[PDB]
Amino acid sequence: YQLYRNTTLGNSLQESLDELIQSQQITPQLALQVLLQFDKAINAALAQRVRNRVNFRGSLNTYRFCDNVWTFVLNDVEFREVTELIKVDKVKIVACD
Amino acid sequence: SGIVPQLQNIVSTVNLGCKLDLKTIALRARNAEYNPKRFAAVIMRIREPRTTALIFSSGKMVCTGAKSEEQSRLAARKYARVVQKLGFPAKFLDFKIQNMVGSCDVKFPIRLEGLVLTHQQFSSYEPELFPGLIYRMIKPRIVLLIFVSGKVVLTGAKVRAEIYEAFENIYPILKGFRKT
Amino acid sequence: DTENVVVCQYDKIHRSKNKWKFHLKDGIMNLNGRDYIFSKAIGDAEW
Amino acid sequence: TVPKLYRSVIEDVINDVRDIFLDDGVDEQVLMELKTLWENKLM
DNA sequence: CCTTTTATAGCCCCCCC
DNA sequence: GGGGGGGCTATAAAAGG
C-alpha cells in the first residue's frame, strides 16, 4: 500500500528525492524504486513494531468509499490515548482495507 | 380518531435522462459510496431533507427516507443538482412516489390471536416468527403490521390518502379487540 | 499550521442511521503538527 | 518511541537501496546525501 | 439476488466490560 | 461472565446487471 507516502516520514523522503532528481543526481526511476522500498519498510515497521491503542470521537462531516478506500473528514474530534487528550477542529482520515 | 398516521418513509424514483459515469460521481461527490462488485449503484446521502439515494449508471435514481411528498421531490431535485454540477446534463423526468409508510398508536392493547381468527382471509399471525400481525387490506390495497402494544404500521401506499383511509378502516376493527 | 491527517487501514467500518463506528489499525497521524502512531484506533461519530 | 521507528525505517530503507544505487552507477555519496536530506527534513 | 428506507418488536448470539 | 449491540425475523416499493 502506497498508503504511507503522504506522511511526515514519506513526504520528507519524496522532497529529498525530487531535489536529487532536480540536480540530476538520481533518475526518476531510481526515486520510484526508493519509494517502493519505503512502502515495504513502513508497512513492516507498523505491524511488527508499534502496538498501542487509540480512541476518537467527533462529528462526521463527510465520507466517501470508492476503490475499497474510505476517506472521512471529522470535525471537533478528540483523540484519546491512555495518557489523555488531543483535540482538533478537523481531521481527514484515509483508510485502505 | 384524533389519531393521525404520521408518514415515516417514502420511496420515489426519477429519471435523470442521461447515462452516468458512476466512478466520477463517487470520486468527486461528497457522502458517496460506490462498490460495483457488491452493488451496481452509487449510494449518496444528504442531510436536508435527510435521505439516501441510489443512483444507477442508466440515469435512473431511487430516493428514500423522506417523510413528506414535498421532501421526497426536493431531496431528489438536490441529488439531481449534485450530479448536474459534476458536469452531467441531468434532467428530472417522470418523478414518482412509489411507496409510503405510516405509523401510529391506538393507545390500547390488542387481542391479536382473536383478530387473526376472525379475519383469516385478510391476515396472518405467527408470533414465533414475527411478533406482529400482518393485515392485507383490499381497499385501499395497503398492508398493515399490527402489534399487541397497539402500535400500527401501514405500508404499500402510492398516495397519502390510502394511508389515512386504511387506518380509518382498521381502527373500528381494532377497537373490537381491545384488551380489558 | 497542520493538516490533521490519519493514514491507515480499516478492519471494520459500521453505520446505523447516522451513527458511524470506525475500527482502524496501523495508522500514522499528524495532529496539530505532531506525529503519532497506533496499531489500533476505535472511533465514534454522528453524521 | 516514534523517532526510534523513523530512524529504524530510514536505516532499513537506506541499507536496502544501496545495491540499487550501485547497480545504477550512482556514487554512494549520493546515497548518503539522500539520508542526510531526509533526516534533516524530519527536523 | 445485490441494496436502501422506516415504523414495529421478540429472540438469538457475541463482544469485551 | 454478562449486557448491549448486532442480527434475524416481517412489510412495501423502485432501480438493473
Domain interval for residue D3:
1-43
Question: Which residues sit opposite B39 in a β-bridge?
Answer: B35
- Which domains, and CATH codes, for chain A? 1-51 (1.10.287.190), 52-97 (2.30.18.10)
Question: For residue B8, which of B146, B104, B101 has the smallest C-alpha distance?
Answer: B101
Q: Which CATH superfamily is domain B1-11+98-179 in?
A: TATA-Binding Protein (3.30.310.10)
Nearest chain C residue (CA) to B47:
C47
**Sequence ranges of chain B with CATH classification 3.30.310.10:** 1-11+98-179, 12-97
Backbone angles phi, psi at B49, to 5 degrees: -75, 145
Would you say the C-alpha torsion B158, B159, B160, B165 has a positive or negative sign? negative
As a rounded value in angstroms, the CA-to-C1' distance for D18 and E14 is 51
What HEC string does D1-43 produce? CHHHHHHHHHHHHHHHHHHHHHHHCCCHHHHHHHHHHHHHHHC
Q: Which nucleotide is nearest to B102 (CA to C1')?
A: E7
User: Residue A7 half-sphere exposure, CB side, CA atoms within 13 Å?
Assistant: 25
**Pair B143, B137: CB distance under 8 Å:** yes
Number of domains making up chain D: 1
**Pair D28, A73: CB distance under 8 Å:** no
Resolution in A: 2.1
**CB spacing of A66 vs B32 below 8 angstroms:** yes
Question: Which residues sit opposite A95 in a β-bridge?
Answer: A70, C8
**Pair A78, A57: CB distance under 8 Å:** yes
Residue nearest to nucleotide E2 (CA to C1'): B39
> In Å, how far are B118, B136, B151, B153, C25 from B121, measured between CA atoms?
9, 9, 22, 19, 56
Note the Cα C45 to chain centre separation in Å. 10
Domain B12-97 grouped into CATH 1.10.340.30: no
A95 → closest Cβ in C24, C42, C47: C24
Cβ-proximal residues to B118 (8 Å cutoff; 6+ apart), any chain: none
User: Residue A72 half-sphere exposure, CB side, CA atoms within 13 Å?
Assistant: 28
What's the CATH number where D33 sits? 1.10.287.100
Grid coordinates given for A74: 471529522
Residue nearest to nucleotide F13 (CA to C1'): B99
- Which domains, and CATH codes, for chain C? 1-47 (2.30.18.10)
**Chain A positions in Cβ-Cβ contact with residue C26 (cut-off 8 Å):** 43, 46-47, 50
Experimental approach taken: X-ray
